[PDB]
Amino acid sequence: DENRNLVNMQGMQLTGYPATGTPPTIQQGANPAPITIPNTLMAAKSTTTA
């Protein structure tokens, strides 16, 4: 939808597990948060190793 949320129609919010970290990881043990999809930018990430 326009809020960057996954919905049916209906209109109800699709939920799932939240992602965290950089790159994001799935917190399977976390509560079933609403799934959203931001259209904002991936920040640059310095080389750490090579």
Add this chain to the structure above:
Amino acid sequence: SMQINLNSTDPVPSKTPFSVSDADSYNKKGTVTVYDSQGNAHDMNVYFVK
């Protein structure tokens, strides 16, 4: 209550720090929602470290 099933062969030697973020220092990150005296939700994060 929290019924946990762990894989017998999943060790954590990669890291020792925690701070609810050092993935390598643990094997499982689970969260149990609990209520305080006003019912305010709390995030019982539980870490299992082999």
